[PDB]
Amino acid sequence: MQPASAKWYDRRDYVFIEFCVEDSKDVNVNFEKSKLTFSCLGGSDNFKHLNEIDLFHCIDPNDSKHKRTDRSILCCLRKGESGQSWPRLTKERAKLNWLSVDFNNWKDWE
Amino acid sequence: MQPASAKWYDRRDYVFIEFCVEDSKDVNVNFEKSKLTFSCLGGSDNFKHLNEIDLFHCIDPNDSKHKRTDRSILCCLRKGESGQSWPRLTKERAKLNWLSVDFNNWKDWE
User: Fold this and answer.
1) From the list A34, A81, A93, which residue is nearest B57 (CB)?
2) Residues with Cβ < 8 Å from A61, sequence gap 6 or more?
3) Would you call A31 helix, strand, or coil by DSSP?
4) Do A80 and B80 lie within an 8 Å CB cutoff?
5) Pairwise CA distance, residues B76 & B51, whole Å
6) Which chain A residues contact residue B58 at CB under 8 A?
7) Which residues form the CS domain (chains A, B)?
8) CA B79, CA B60: separation in Å to the nearest integer?
9) In this complex, is the C-beta atom of B34 within 8 Å of any C-beta atom belonging to chain A?
């Protein structure tokens, strides 16, 4: 297995993470207060994907959700605090080779 | 003004920060989900103290409190999530020259 590639961006109250997996199945998103876990199989070859990250800021798991399509899986995380500033997605600064900013959707709402 | 010296430690559900200010007055503690702000005057000369820190993990402000004495001000922060692990007090890997671990009260409750 290996992490699915993903891009992220945020709004005032929400953080968005998109996992790019074609024809995904067994999609499994687990929202925690300070952690996110995504897993699924990709393609007819059942390619295993697993993404786990400690979030920079806390979120509200019970108010977070995800949508899936044949193209990818979009996660919507409710920021634990409105207007929360997210300079990065993860708790620690170290960069992840599968994660990048979604510049197509990025905005300076603040 | 300058930060008051302070030591910290945690238990399963709470994080404790003690600001060492003798004969404090105008004590002002502001608890926010991911931030703590402490200010006060020290001694007869009205020495100004101000401490601000972005917390490693989110806390529950509504359930946090502080107690003052002529010796110091002890803050009790309710962890946003029971059992939360706090390897450091601050969001970033920071060496704050005024902050140190309270080894007298420290425990490995885990």
Assistant:
1) A34
2) A31, A32, A33
3) strand
4) yes
5) 15
6) 33-34, 57-58, 80-81
7) 1-90
8) 6
9) yes
Contact predicate A95/A2, CB 8 Å: no
The CA R_g of chain A, rounded to the nearest whole Å, is 13
Query: Is the CB of B81 less than 8 angstroms away from the CB of A57?
Result: no
Q: Which residues of A touch B32 (CB under 8 A)?
A: 81
| CA closest to A56 among chain B residues | B91
Residues in B touching A58 (Cβ below 8 Å): 33-34, 57-58, 80-81
Among residues B32, B40, B39, the alpha carbon closest in space to that of B58 is found at B32
Domain boundary assignment for chain A = 1-110
Breaks in chain A, after residue numbers (C to N greater than 2.5 Å): none
Resolution as reported, in Å: 2.5
Fold classification of A1-110 (topology level): Immunoglobulin-like (2.60.40)
Widest CA span in chain B: 44
Could you tell me how many residues make up chain A?
A: 110
Technique used to solve these coordinates: X-ray
Which residues from chain A sit within 8 angstroms of residue B93, using beta carbons? 92-93
Angle made by CA atoms B16, B20, B21, in degrees to the nearest 5: 135
Write the single-letter amino acid at B92: E
The SS3 assignment for A56 reads coil
Instruction: Specify the 3-state DSSP secondary structure of A96.
Output: coil
| Pairwise CA distance, residues A105 & A33, whole Å | 24
Integer distance in angstroms from the first to the last C-alpha of chain B?
38
How far, rounded to the nearest angstrom, does the alpha carbon of residue B97 sit from its chain's CA centroid?
14
